[PDB]
């Protein structure tokens, strides 16, 4: 349940949509169907990766060693581009995918 | 103007947990007519404060009494603009976090702005309507003056 | 074997200049003075006197290595005033203070003995 | 072991903690000296934290000038309790633990072996991985 809530991208409530994504993007998200199909396929791929991870790492250890520090890169991007977290953004989730 | 906030506070505690530092004490003030809690660290050696004191707090984005910003570069030989020198205690910090009472759908009704004055922190909770002048990474001045 | 002679800490050799003036290109109206064969005995007085001047915005000194005798002084001043003028005024004021101090100490000695 | 093999050793390390306490307020002349010993300094003296009734800087306000570039990091002091992260004052930290470096400025926290030391993810490790050897070298020298 926590995994689905954290990684699902509910596109139905539409109030979270108006609060987080911009107005010209929320109408696009609510109108298109190819966007919704891609967004559901992304979560399907994430679920399969979750099962693969659980097979590779029993005993539930998250700590791992990998080459790129994604969270610190995201923090640097936020500070470099003066991102304000209190406002809706202009990033299209299809562009993200 | 450039005055983001202005209110009169009363000191309720000086160190509820204990004396953590020799020359720094953490005031726990509460507002009047605004109902805005404050948690401020004040150099007490230079500016002594004791219980029950009332001071007028002003938080301004500039000191120059006309609107122009300062660029953050120190210069003492600039008395020409006649800065806001009617206060006793002045600090200079950078707001680093604006917590809120948001949710998935409803917007926030109470905010909490944190400012770091080169180590000496400050949290200023209250209503979300009079706390709108604060944006993160923005330089902010603090001005205090004890009322007799 | 590798011991430098003791007199090398205060004697300028053939070719060495006592003081050389260089500008600082990072900030306007800044200048660096390099003094050879000196130490804190002069650096501290000159710095503390430069700080008294209200038209001096920066004034410091440092010894880059304790085994090599050389003093670097950096002073930045407000426009319509030059760091060379600030330096010369500082030295003149120090000399005046020392002369007055010597006069008063001599008169105090005279008062103390046979008086 | 993909960790920095060299770090601050015990004398700058016993003194950076005292420098980075909250109480350290520096006079104008002391700031002049310390900036005179900075090799990667722009040339502009930052605005003092305490501006009235006497201009006073702070140890963190100068370690911010020492820290290079725009480095973002979050460490934890060696005397950080097990209740601050849970209860209130999570981001206020009464004892001045929970080191935070945003945009190359030491916003809060006390620096110790767990921040400047030879451990993974420390401030020096982040400085290396972000800026390179040529800037980490100056980092070490300026700190010392």
Coordinates of C-alpha atoms in Angstrom, one line a residue:
Chain A
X1 CA 0.0 0.0 0.0
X2 CA 2.8 2.4 0.9
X3 CA 4.6 1.6 -2.4
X4 CA 1.5 2.2 -4.5
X5 CA 0.7 5.4 -2.7
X6 CA 4.2 6.8 -3.1
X7 CA 4.9 5.7 -6.7
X8 CA 1.5 5.5 -8.4
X9 CA 0.8 9.0 -9.7
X10 CA -2.9 9.3 -9.1
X11 CA -4.3 11.3 -12.1
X12 CA -7.9 11.0 -10.9
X13 CA -8.2 13.2 -7.8
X14 CA -7.3 16.3 -9.8
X15 CA -7.1 18.5 -6.8
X16 CA -3.6 17.3 -6.0
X17 CA -3.1 17.8 -9.7
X18 CA -4.2 21.4 -9.6
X19 CA -2.0 21.9 -6.5
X20 CA 1.2 20.3 -7.8
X21 CA 1.1 20.6 -11.7
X22 CA 0.3 23.7 -13.7
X23 CA -3.1 24.5 -15.1
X24 CA -2.1 24.0 -18.8
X25 CA -0.7 20.6 -17.9
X26 CA -3.5 19.3 -15.7
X27 CA -6.0 19.7 -18.6
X28 CA -3.7 17.8 -20.9
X29 CA -3.2 15.0 -18.3
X30 CA -7.0 14.7 -17.7
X31 CA -7.8 14.8 -21.4
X32 CA -5.2 12.4 -23.0
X33 CA -5.3 8.6 -22.9
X34 CA -1.9 7.8 -24.3
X35 CA -0.4 9.8 -21.4
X36 CA -2.4 7.7 -18.9
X37 CA -1.4 4.5 -20.6
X38 CA 2.3 5.4 -20.4
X39 CA 1.9 6.5 -16.7
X40 CA 0.3 3.1 -15.9
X41 CA 3.0 1.2 -17.8
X42 CA 5.7 3.1 -15.8
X43 CA 4.2 1.8 -12.5
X44 CA 4.0 -1.7 -14.0
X45 CA 7.7 -1.6 -14.8
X46 CA 8.4 -0.3 -11.3
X47 CA 6.4 -3.2 -9.7
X48 CA 8.4 -5.7 -11.8
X49 CA 11.7 -4.0 -10.7
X50 CA 10.5 -4.2 -7.1
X51 CA 10.0 -8.0 -7.4
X52 CA 13.4 -8.4 -9.0
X53 CA 15.0 -6.3 -6.2
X54 CA 13.3 -8.5 -3.5
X55 CA 14.7 -11.6 -5.2
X56 CA 18.2 -10.1 -5.4
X57 CA 18.2 -8.7 -1.8
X58 CA 16.5 -10.9 0.7
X59 CA 16.8 -9.9 4.4
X60 CA 15.7 -6.4 3.2
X61 CA 18.8 -4.3 3.0
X62 CA 18.3 -1.0 1.1
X63 CA 21.9 0.2 1.5
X64 CA 23.8 -0.2 -1.8
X65 CA 26.8 1.2 -3.7
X66 CA 26.1 2.8 -7.0
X67 CA 28.0 5.4 -9.2
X68 CA 25.7 8.4 -9.5
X69 CA 24.3 10.2 -6.4
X70 CA 20.9 10.9 -7.7
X71 CA 19.4 12.6 -4.6
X72 CA 22.4 15.0 -4.2
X73 CA 22.2 15.7 -8.0
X74 CA 18.5 16.6 -7.5
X75 CA 19.3 18.8 -4.6
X76 CA 22.0 20.6 -6.6
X77 CA 19.6 21.1 -9.5
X78 CA 17.0 22.6 -7.2
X79 CA 19.5 25.0 -5.7
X80 CA 21.0 25.9 -9.1
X81 CA 17.7 26.7 -10.8
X82 CA 16.2 28.5 -7.8
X83 CA 13.2 26.1 -7.7
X84 CA 10.4 27.1 -5.4
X85 CA 8.7 24.1 -3.9
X86 CA 5.5 25.9 -2.9
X87 CA 4.3 26.5 -6.4
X88 CA 3.0 24.3 -9.2
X89 CA 5.6 23.2 -11.8
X90 CA 5.9 23.1 -15.6
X91 CA 7.3 19.6 -15.9
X92 CA 5.2 17.2 -17.9
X93 CA 5.2 13.7 -16.4
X94 CA 5.3 12.3 -20.0
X95 CA 8.4 14.4 -20.5
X96 CA 9.8 12.8 -17.4
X97 CA 9.1 9.2 -18.6
Chain B
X1 CA 9.2 50.0 2.8
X2 CA 10.5 46.5 2.6
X3 CA 9.2 45.6 6.1
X4 CA 8.0 42.0 5.8
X5 CA 6.8 41.7 9.4
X6 CA 6.4 43.9 12.6
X7 CA 4.9 42.9 15.9
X8 CA 5.5 43.2 19.7
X9 CA 6.6 40.1 21.6
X10 CA 6.7 39.0 25.2
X11 CA 9.4 36.6 26.6
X12 CA 8.0 33.4 28.2
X13 CA 11.2 31.3 28.6
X14 CA 15.0 31.7 28.2
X15 CA 16.2 28.1 28.2
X16 CA 13.4 25.5 28.7
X17 CA 15.8 22.6 28.1
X18 CA 18.8 24.2 29.7
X19 CA 21.8 26.5 29.2
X20 CA 23.3 24.9 26.1
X21 CA 25.8 27.7 25.4
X22 CA 27.7 30.3 27.4
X23 CA 27.0 33.4 25.4
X24 CA 23.8 32.5 23.6
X25 CA 20.3 31.9 25.0
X26 CA 17.1 30.9 23.2
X27 CA 14.1 33.0 23.9
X28 CA 10.7 31.5 23.6
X29 CA 8.4 34.5 22.9
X30 CA 4.7 34.7 22.1
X31 CA 3.1 37.5 20.2
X32 CA 0.3 40.0 20.9
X33 CA -2.7 40.6 18.7
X34 CA -1.2 38.2 16.1
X35 CA -0.7 34.9 18.1
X36 CA 2.6 34.0 16.6
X37 CA 5.1 31.9 18.5
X38 CA 8.8 32.8 18.2
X39 CA 11.9 30.8 19.0
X40 CA 15.0 33.1 18.7
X41 CA 18.6 32.8 19.8
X42 CA 20.0 36.1 21.0
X43 CA 23.6 36.9 22.0
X44 CA 22.9 37.7 25.7
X45 CA 26.4 39.1 26.6
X46 CA 26.1 41.9 24.1
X47 CA 22.3 42.3 24.4
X48 CA 21.1 41.1 27.8
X49 CA 17.5 39.8 28.0
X50 CA 15.5 38.6 31.0
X51 CA 12.0 37.1 31.6
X52 CA 8.9 39.2 31.0
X53 CA 10.6 41.6 28.6
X54 CA 8.6 43.2 25.8
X55 CA 10.4 44.1 22.5
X56 CA 9.2 45.2 19.1
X57 CA 10.4 42.9 16.4
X58 CA 10.8 44.0 12.8
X59 CA 11.9 41.7 10.0
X60 CA 12.8 43.6 6.9
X61 CA 14.3 42.7 3.5
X62 CA 16.4 45.8 3.4
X63 CA 17.8 48.3 5.9
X64 CA 17.9 51.4 3.6
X65 CA 14.5 52.9 4.3
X66 CA 13.9 53.4 0.6
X67 CA 13.6 49.9 -1.1
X68 CA 17.0 49.3 -2.6
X69 CA 18.8 46.1 -1.5
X70 CA 22.3 45.9 0.0
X71 CA 24.2 43.2 -2.0
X72 CA 25.4 41.7 1.3
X73 CA 28.8 43.4 1.1
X74 CA 29.8 45.0 4.4
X75 CA 30.6 48.7 4.2
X76 CA 30.6 50.9 7.4
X77 CA 31.3 54.2 5.5
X78 CA 27.8 54.5 4.1
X79 CA 25.9 56.6 6.6
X80 CA 24.4 58.6 3.7
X81 CA 21.2 56.6 3.1
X82 CA 20.3 56.8 6.9
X83 CA 19.5 53.2 7.5
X84 CA 17.0 52.0 10.1
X85 CA 19.0 52.8 13.2
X86 CA 16.1 53.3 15.6
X87 CA 16.5 49.7 16.9
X88 CA 19.0 48.3 19.4
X89 CA 19.6 44.7 18.2
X90 CA 20.1 44.0 14.5
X91 CA 20.9 40.7 12.9
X92 CA 21.3 39.5 9.3
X93 CA 20.3 36.0 8.1
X94 CA 18.9 33.8 5.3
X95 CA 15.6 31.9 5.5
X96 CA 16.3 28.3 4.8
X97 CA 13.0 26.5 5.2
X98 CA 9.3 27.4 5.2
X99 CA 7.3 24.5 6.7
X100 CA 3.6 24.5 6.3
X101 CA 0.3 22.9 7.2
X102 CA -0.6 21.8 3.7
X103 CA -2.1 18.5 2.6
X104 CA -2.9 16.6 -0.6
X105 CA -5.7 19.0 -1.6
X106 CA -6.3 21.8 0.9
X107 CA -3.9 24.6 1.0
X108 CA -2.0 25.8 4.1
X109 CA -3.4 27.9 6.9
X110 CA -0.3 28.1 9.2
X111 CA 3.3 28.5 8.2
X112 CA 6.6 28.4 10.0
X113 CA 9.6 30.4 8.7
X114 CA 13.1 29.4 9.8
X115 CA 15.9 32.0 9.4
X116 CA 19.6 31.3 10.2
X117 CA 21.6 34.4 11.4
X118 CA 25.0 32.8 10.8
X119 CA 24.4 30.0 13.3
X120 CA 21.8 31.7 15.5
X121 CA 18.5 30.2 14.3
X122 CA 15.0 31.6 14.5
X123 CA 11.5 30.0 14.0
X124 CA 8.4 32.2 13.5
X125 CA 5.2 30.3 13.4
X126 CA 1.7 31.8 13.0
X127 CA -1.0 32.4 10.4
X128 CA -0.3 32.0 6.7
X129 CA -1.6 35.4 5.7
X130 CA 0.9 37.7 7.4
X131 CA 3.8 35.4 6.7
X132 CA 3.8 35.8 2.9
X133 CA 6.9 38.0 2.5
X134 CA 9.3 35.1 3.2
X135 CA 10.9 33.1 0.4
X136 CA 13.7 30.7 0.9
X137 CA 17.3 31.7 0.2
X138 CA 16.4 35.3 0.6
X139 CA 18.5 37.6 2.9
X140 CA 16.6 39.0 5.8
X141 CA 17.3 41.5 8.6
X142 CA 16.0 41.3 12.2
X143 CA 15.5 44.4 14.3
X144 CA 14.7 44.4 18.0
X145 CA 14.0 47.1 20.6
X146 CA 12.9 46.7 24.2
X147 CA 9.8 48.6 25.2
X148 CA 9.9 50.2 28.7
Chain C
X1 CA 75.2 21.9 8.3
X2 CA 72.1 23.6 6.7
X3 CA 72.0 26.2 9.4
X4 CA 71.4 29.7 8.1
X5 CA 73.6 32.4 9.8
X6 CA 71.7 34.4 12.4
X7 CA 72.2 37.7 10.7
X8 CA 70.1 36.7 7.7
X9 CA 66.9 37.5 9.6
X10 CA 67.5 41.3 9.6
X11 CA 70.2 42.0 6.9
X12 CA 69.2 42.7 3.3
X13 CA 71.7 41.1 0.9
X14 CA 73.0 42.3 -2.5
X15 CA 69.9 42.9 -4.6
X16 CA 67.1 42.6 -2.1
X17 CA 64.7 45.6 -1.9
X18 CA 63.3 46.6 1.5
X19 CA 59.7 47.2 0.3
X20 CA 57.9 46.5 -3.0
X21 CA 54.5 47.8 -3.9
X22 CA 51.9 45.7 -5.8
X23 CA 48.3 46.2 -6.7
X24 CA 45.5 43.8 -6.0
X25 CA 43.3 43.2 -9.1
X26 CA 40.4 41.4 -7.4
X27 CA 39.0 44.5 -5.6
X28 CA 39.3 48.2 -6.6
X29 CA 41.5 50.5 -4.4
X30 CA 43.5 47.6 -2.9
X31 CA 47.2 47.3 -2.6
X32 CA 49.7 44.8 -1.2
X33 CA 53.0 45.8 0.4
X34 CA 55.8 43.2 0.7
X35 CA 58.5 44.0 3.3
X36 CA 61.7 42.0 3.5
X37 CA 63.5 41.2 6.8
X38 CA 60.6 42.2 9.1
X39 CA 58.3 40.4 11.5
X40 CA 55.3 41.0 13.8
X41 CA 57.2 43.8 15.6
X42 CA 56.4 46.1 12.7
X43 CA 53.4 44.2 11.1
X44 CA 51.2 44.5 14.2
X45 CA 51.8 48.2 14.8
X46 CA 51.1 49.1 11.1
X47 CA 48.0 46.9 11.0
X48 CA 46.5 48.3 14.3
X49 CA 47.3 51.9 13.2
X50 CA 45.7 51.3 9.7
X51 CA 42.5 50.1 11.4
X52 CA 42.1 53.4 13.3
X53 CA 41.7 55.2 10.0
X54 CA 38.0 55.6 9.1
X55 CA 38.7 55.5 5.4
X56 CA 40.4 52.1 5.5
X57 CA 38.1 49.2 4.7
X58 CA 40.6 46.3 5.1
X59 CA 44.0 46.2 6.8
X60 CA 45.9 43.0 7.6
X61 CA 49.3 41.4 7.6
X62 CA 50.7 37.9 7.6
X63 CA 54.1 36.1 7.7
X64 CA 53.9 33.4 4.9
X65 CA 56.5 31.2 6.6
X66 CA 58.3 31.4 10.0
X67 CA 61.6 30.2 8.4
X68 CA 61.6 32.9 5.7
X69 CA 61.7 36.5 6.9
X70 CA 59.1 38.5 4.9
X71 CA 56.0 40.5 5.8
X72 CA 53.0 41.0 3.5
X73 CA 50.5 43.8 4.3
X74 CA 47.2 44.3 2.5
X75 CA 45.2 47.5 2.8
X76 CA 42.0 48.5 0.9
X77 CA 40.6 52.0 1.3
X78 CA 37.5 54.0 0.3
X79 CA 37.6 55.9 -3.0
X80 CA 39.1 59.4 -3.1
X81 CA 41.8 58.0 -0.8
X82 CA 44.7 55.7 -1.7
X83 CA 46.3 52.9 0.3
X84 CA 49.7 54.4 -0.1
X85 CA 48.5 57.6 1.6
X86 CA 46.9 55.5 4.3
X87 CA 50.2 53.6 4.8
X88 CA 52.3 56.8 5.0
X89 CA 49.9 58.5 7.4
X90 CA 49.9 55.4 9.6
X91 CA 53.7 55.5 9.8
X92 CA 53.8 59.2 10.5
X93 CA 51.2 58.8 13.3
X94 CA 53.2 56.0 14.8
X95 CA 56.3 58.1 14.8
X96 CA 54.5 61.0 16.5
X97 CA 53.1 58.7 19.2
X98 CA 56.5 57.2 19.9
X99 CA 58.2 60.6 20.1
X100 CA 55.6 61.9 22.6
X101 CA 55.9 58.7 24.6
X102 CA 59.7 59.0 24.8
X103 CA 59.4 62.7 25.9
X104 CA 56.9 61.8 28.7
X105 CA 58.9 58.8 29.9
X106 CA 62.1 61.0 30.1
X107 CA 60.2 63.7 32.1
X108 CA 58.8 60.9 34.4
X109 CA 62.3 59.6 35.0
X110 CA 63.4 63.1 35.9
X111 CA 60.5 63.5 38.3
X112 CA 61.2 60.1 39.9
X113 CA 64.9 60.6 40.6
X114 CA 65.9 63.8 42.4
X115 CA 62.3 65.0 42.8
Chain D
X1 CA 36.9 1.5 0.2
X2 CA 35.8 4.5 -1.9
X3 CA 36.4 6.9 1.0
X4 CA 38.7 9.9 1.3
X5 CA 42.1 8.6 2.4
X6 CA 43.2 11.8 4.1
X7 CA 41.3 14.3 6.3
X8 CA 41.8 16.8 9.0
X9 CA 44.1 15.4 11.7
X10 CA 43.4 16.1 15.4
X11 CA 44.6 19.7 15.8
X12 CA 42.7 21.5 13.2
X13 CA 40.1 18.8 14.1
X14 CA 40.2 19.6 17.9
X15 CA 39.8 23.3 17.0
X16 CA 37.2 23.3 14.2
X17 CA 34.6 22.1 16.7
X18 CA 35.4 25.0 19.0
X19 CA 35.4 27.3 16.0
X20 CA 32.0 26.1 14.8
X21 CA 30.2 26.3 18.2
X22 CA 27.4 28.9 18.3
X23 CA 29.2 31.2 20.8
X24 CA 32.1 32.1 18.6
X25 CA 31.8 35.8 17.7
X26 CA 34.7 37.4 15.9
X27 CA 35.8 41.0 16.0
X28 CA 36.6 43.1 12.9
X29 CA 40.4 42.7 13.3
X30 CA 40.2 39.0 13.9
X31 CA 38.1 38.7 10.7
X32 CA 40.7 40.7 8.9
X33 CA 43.5 38.4 10.0
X34 CA 41.6 35.2 9.2
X35 CA 40.6 36.4 5.7
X36 CA 44.3 37.4 5.3
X37 CA 45.0 33.7 5.6
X38 CA 42.5 32.6 3.0
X39 CA 43.9 31.8 -0.4
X40 CA 40.6 31.3 -2.3
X41 CA 38.9 34.5 -1.0
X42 CA 37.1 36.8 -3.4
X43 CA 38.0 40.1 -1.7
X44 CA 34.7 41.1 -0.2
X45 CA 34.1 41.0 3.6
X46 CA 30.6 39.5 4.3
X47 CA 28.0 41.4 6.3
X48 CA 28.3 40.5 10.0
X49 CA 25.6 38.5 11.6
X50 CA 25.3 40.8 14.7
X51 CA 25.2 44.3 13.3
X52 CA 24.2 46.3 16.4
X53 CA 25.2 47.3 19.0
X54 CA 28.6 46.0 17.7
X55 CA 29.6 44.3 14.4
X56 CA 30.3 40.7 15.1
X57 CA 30.9 37.8 12.7
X58 CA 30.7 34.1 13.5
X59 CA 32.8 31.0 13.1
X60 CA 30.3 29.4 10.7
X61 CA 30.2 32.7 8.7
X62 CA 33.9 32.2 7.9
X63 CA 33.9 28.5 7.5
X64 CA 31.3 29.3 4.8
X65 CA 33.9 31.3 3.0
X66 CA 36.4 28.4 3.4
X67 CA 33.9 25.8 1.9
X68 CA 34.3 25.8 -1.9
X69 CA 31.8 26.1 -4.7
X70 CA 28.1 25.2 -4.1
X71 CA 28.4 22.1 -2.0
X72 CA 25.2 20.6 -0.5
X73 CA 25.6 18.2 2.4
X74 CA 23.9 17.0 5.6
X75 CA 26.0 15.4 8.4
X76 CA 25.4 14.8 12.1
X77 CA 27.6 15.8 15.1
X78 CA 28.9 13.1 17.4
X79 CA 26.8 14.2 20.4
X80 CA 23.5 14.4 18.5
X81 CA 20.7 12.8 20.6
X82 CA 18.1 10.2 19.6
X83 CA 15.1 12.5 20.2
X84 CA 15.8 15.6 18.1
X85 CA 15.2 13.8 14.9
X86 CA 11.9 12.5 16.2
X87 CA 10.2 15.1 18.4
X88 CA 9.9 18.8 17.7
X89 CA 12.8 21.1 16.9
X90 CA 13.9 18.7 14.1
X91 CA 15.2 21.6 12.1
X92 CA 16.1 23.8 15.0
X93 CA 18.5 21.5 17.0
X94 CA 18.9 23.1 20.4
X95 CA 22.4 21.7 20.8
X96 CA 23.6 22.9 17.4
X97 CA 24.1 19.4 15.9
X98 CA 22.8 18.3 12.4
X99 CA 25.3 20.0 10.2
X100 CA 23.7 21.5 7.1
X101 CA 25.7 22.9 4.1
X102 CA 23.5 24.6 1.4
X103 CA 25.1 26.3 -1.6
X104 CA 28.5 26.2 0.0
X105 CA 27.5 27.9 3.3
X106 CA 27.6 26.3 6.7
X107 CA 24.0 27.1 7.8
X108 CA 24.1 25.2 11.0
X109 CA 25.9 22.4 12.9
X110 CA 29.2 21.7 14.6
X111 CA 32.0 20.3 12.5
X112 CA 33.9 17.3 13.8
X113 CA 35.5 14.0 12.7
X114 CA 32.2 12.9 11.2
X115 CA 32.1 15.9 8.9
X116 CA 35.8 16.7 8.0
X117 CA 37.1 13.2 8.6
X118 CA 38.1 10.3 6.4
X119 CA 34.7 8.7 6.2
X120 CA 32.4 8.1 3.3
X121 CA 30.2 10.9 2.3
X122 CA 31.9 13.5 4.5
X123 CA 32.2 17.1 3.5
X124 CA 35.7 16.6 2.1
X125 CA 34.4 13.6 0.1
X126 CA 31.6 15.6 -1.4
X127 CA 34.0 18.4 -2.2
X128 CA 36.2 16.0 -4.1
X129 CA 33.4 14.3 -6.0
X130 CA 31.9 17.6 -6.9
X131 CA 34.9 19.9 -7.6
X132 CA 38.1 17.9 -8.2
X133 CA 41.5 17.5 -6.7
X134 CA 42.6 21.0 -7.6
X135 CA 39.9 22.5 -5.4
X136 CA 40.0 19.9 -2.6
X137 CA 43.8 20.7 -2.2
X138 CA 43.0 24.3 -1.5
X139 CA 40.1 23.2 0.8
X140 CA 42.6 21.3 3.0
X141 CA 45.2 24.0 3.0
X142 CA 42.7 26.8 3.8
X143 CA 41.1 24.9 6.6
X144 CA 44.4 24.2 8.2

